[PDB]
Design a protein around this ligand. Structure first.
Ligand code: HEM
Ligand SMILES: Clc1ccccc1C(c1ccccc1)(c1ccccc1)n1ccnc1
Length: 456
């Protein structure tokens, strides 16, 4: 029977908006979902979203005959930067399907086998950094994972070396992007955007845009000028033709894809590796099991592609980390036509739904009562997981194109970490989840005692 949709508390003309006046809006939305259940309406001035949290409703929203990928408010905002790249394009935009067809071969098994050696290059730099620490020095986990994941996408994707392990501070490209996005957001909150007090902000913004454009120019120019032509993501961007049309990407779209992939390729994976290490050091029985697997499988000085595929329990650790804290914590959908969701909630054409992935992943009707515990064995039998219960990589044709890249990199790196070191949660770290568009365990630190096993 038709039901009235719960809605949290309203503040006059501001509606629900100031419930998100917090540095942890996703964690706030989870608490609302705890109070109101599987679906709730959330209104801001001029905007309406419905937040879904149950597998039963999310399964229906994932029916692509009824619902398509929506560009949420955050996606429409970052579209100013990522244009009609794969992430920030509508499914019905010609450049989506075209780039999808051209770039999908960059994530084939053959391509993955080709990325493996370059992933090992960066993973070795990570291990060697930690091997080289003096006594009593600790590791800043998310910081080092970010160094790794940035360098991995740069190298595997574009043959560009960020050399993040040679720097104290983040690469200027990252700093520029962060500061440009922060400025663009601050702009929207300024009562008087033409106040001369903001002149320096505007000048800084142009400089930051130029840092980003200079890197994209260099990545393209160095490839075109090189004697080596390689076979990577950039190769397909520059040369690949859409089989449906015979056309290659145009120059403008290529530039959007490059920055799209540089950003997509690193920060969500960095958080995954950080959360996985967090859970491991908090669950010493799981850590021992994972470490036993790493020692038994990784019998050569550097892992091979096939050995990474054999790290089954490491893979389950990573899925269980993505269950609890999926590092892209939502994706957005809209109703293609008028329709009724769950036989209970009528929707008009165009209505937006937000999939609240952390809350999906805590649906007790699917996972049982222990949803807050870290138990990788939940994934021991993959056929037992109902479809649409586990969605850290989105849905359908708009699912993450890089999912296998991310997981292969993370499995490789976590395996090598577990082979080469014993880890200590020397501060008894208290989980504090810092939110941007992603999630990270802020201030997570550990010590790594080397097992003195040499690399190749
Ligand atoms: C743990 C790591 C990752 C997570 C959690 C993640 C998550 C997601 C999710 C949820 C989407 C769907 C977005 C939406 O529906 O609006 C998505 C799309 C995408 N991801 Fe990822 N991602 C990860 C890693 C990567 C990596 C390593 C790359 C690139 C090498 C990548 C590139 C993309 C692209 C290009 C899309 C857009 C696909 C399309 O619609 O054509 N992601 N990702
Ligand atoms: Cl937001 C964004 C912009 C450009 C590329 C990728 C992504 C996205 C993401 C999410 C959180 C923090 C940084 C990037 C993302 C966009 C929309 C919905 C989910 C994730 N992403 C990273 C990996 N795959 C997709």
């Amino acid at each position: 029977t038709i039901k009235e949709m719960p809605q949290p508390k309203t503040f006059g003309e501001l509606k629900n908006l100031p419930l998100l006046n917090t540095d942890k809006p996703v964690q706030a939305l989870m608490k609302i979902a705890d109070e109101l259940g599987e679906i709730f309406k959330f209104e801001a001035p001029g905007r309406v979203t419905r937040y879904l949290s149950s597998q039963r409703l999310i399964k229906e929203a994932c029916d692509e005959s009824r619902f398509d990928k929506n560009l949420s408010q955050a996606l429409k905002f970052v579209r100013d930067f990522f244009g009609d790249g794969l992430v920030t394009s509508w499914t019905h935009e010609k450049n989506w399907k075209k780039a999808h067809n051209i770039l999908l071969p960059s994530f084939s098994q053959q391509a993955m086998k080709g990325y493996h050696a370059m992933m090992v290059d960066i993973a070795v730099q990570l291990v060697q950094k930690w091997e080289r620490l003096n006594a009593d020095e600790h590791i800043e986990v998310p910081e080092d994972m970010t160094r790794l994941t940035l360098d991995t996408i740069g190298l595997c994707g574009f043959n560009y070396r960020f050399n993040s392990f040679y720097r104290d501070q983040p690469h200027p490209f990252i700093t520029s992007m962060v500061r440009a996005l922060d400025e663009a957001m601050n702009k929207l909150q300024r009562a008087n955007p033409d106040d001369p007090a903001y002149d320096e902000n505007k000048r800084q913004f142009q400089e930051d845009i130029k840092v980003m454009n200079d890197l994209v120019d260099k990545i393209i120019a160095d490839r075109k000028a090189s004697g080596e032509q390689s076979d990577d993501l950039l190769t397909h961007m520059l040369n690949g033709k859409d089989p449906e049309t015979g056309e290659p990407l145009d120059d403008e779209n290529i530039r959007y894809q490059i920055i799209t992939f540089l950003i997509a390729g690193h920060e969500t994976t960095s958080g995954l590796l950080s959360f996985a290490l967090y859970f491991l050091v908090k669950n010493p029985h799981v850590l021992q099991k994972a470490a036993e697997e790493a020692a038994r499988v990784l019998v050569d000085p550097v892992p091979s592609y096939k050995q990474v595929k054999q790290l089954k329990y490491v893979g389950m650790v990573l899925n269980e980390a993505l269950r609890l804290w999926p590092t892209a914590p939502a994706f957005s959908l809209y109703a293609k036509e008028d329709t009724v969701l769950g036989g209970e909630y009528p929707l008009e054409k165009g209505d937006e739904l937000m999939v609240l992935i952390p809350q999906l992943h805590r649906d007790k009707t699917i996972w049982g009562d222990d949803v807050e515990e870290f138990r990788p064995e939940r994934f021991e039998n993959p056929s037992a997981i109902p479809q649409h219960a586990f969605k850290p990589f989105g849905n359908g044709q708009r699912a993450c194109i890089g999912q296998q890249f991310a997981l292969h990199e993370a499995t490789l790196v976590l395996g090598m970490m577990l082979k080469h070191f014993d880890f200590e949660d020397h501060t008894n770290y208290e989980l504090d989840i810092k939110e941007t568009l992603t999630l990270k365990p802020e201030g997570f630190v550990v010590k790594a005692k080397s097992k003195k096993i040499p690399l190749g």
